Design a protein around this ligand. Structure first.
Ligand SMILES: [Mg+2]
Length: 82
């Protein structure tokens, strides 16, 4: 039962608030944690949102893209074997 990391990539145009909204909503973070991960990514260029089983991980990558495309932001999100 291998696991997979769900990451988001930093870009220069996506609002800070939407990134915080995303983590709170799709990754189940309190607003303190959300703020941390968002700030971390902003400086590091990449950050782990969470770690799940493959398909759980897969659903979360898809929901972040589908969501990002509706707010019309270019937030990049993908996965990788933990
Ligand atoms: Mg390990």
């Amino acid at each position: 039962p291998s696991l997979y990391r769900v990451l988001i990539l930093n870009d220069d145009y996506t609002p800070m608030e939407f990134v915080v909204y995303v983590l709170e909503r799709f990754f189940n973070k309190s607003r303190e944690d959300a703020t941390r991960i968002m700030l971390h990514v902003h400086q590091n260029g990449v950050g782990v949102c969470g770690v799940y089983t493959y398909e759980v991980a897969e659903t979360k990558v898809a929901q972040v893209i589908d969501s990002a495309r509706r707010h019309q932001h270019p937030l990049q999100c993908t996965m990788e074997k933990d």
